[PDB]
Design a protein around this ligand. Sequence first.
Ligand SMILES: *[C@@H]1O[C@H](CO)[C@@H](O[C@@H]2O[C@H](CO)[C@@H](O)[C@H](O)[C@H]2NC(C)=O)[C@H](O)[C@H]1NC(C)=O
Lengths: 49, 49, 49, 50
Amino acid sequence: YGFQPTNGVGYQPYRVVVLSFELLHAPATVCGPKKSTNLVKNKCVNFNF
Amino acid sequence: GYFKIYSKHTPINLVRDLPQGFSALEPLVDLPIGINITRFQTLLALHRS
Amino acid sequence: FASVYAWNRKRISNCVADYSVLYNSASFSTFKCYGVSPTKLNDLCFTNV
Amino acid sequence: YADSFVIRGDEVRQIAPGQTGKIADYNYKLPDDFTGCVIAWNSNNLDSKV
Ligand SMILES: *[C@@H]1O[C@H](CO)[C@@H](O[C@@H]2O[C@H](CO)[C@@H](O)[C@H](O)[C@H]2NC(C)=O)[C@H](O)[C@H]1NC(C)=O
């Protein structure tokens, strides 16, 4: 490539990064912060274990 | 943008009028500040007693 | 940086200015200079810039 | 997976699932069924030289 500071747009370098994920092929271990609460019992609730 | 001040001091003995002599005025100070000055005032040292 | 309709002005004097650091840097996208060729700018002396 | 590189400004459109150019086919070809994301930005102030 040729990269001079004075070069016009499109002739200037761009940094590119791509992220690729999987769709349930293994026990998931990469996800954001989930604030775990306490554990209730003997009640009709929905859980996210 | 230059404020030029020239000054001179002289001991005198004449009573009232300006002396009828000749004396040059040496330069005193140059200031590199530009203003739109159009009027001026005077300071007096009154006896607060 | 101030807006274009209220462009900011600074008066620089009584200093030793090196233009090579400004000349060689590649951060500046656009350079255009009128009064004197840039290579000669380090050779002159001015006042009230 | 994270894949990083640097390209020219005009060629950013070539990176598109379901496209064939020069970078797209000869340098880096992403499968069209892409389960991910793409990020890009300018680095002229970092990757340019007089
Ligand atoms: C310097 O100050 C004088 C007075 O403060 C300015 O003169 C005024 O200019 C305006 C605009 O034309 C007139 O409407 C006023 O009537 C003028 N007043 C007087 C007393 O003349 C003058 O423009 C100022 N100069 C600069 C460079 O700022």
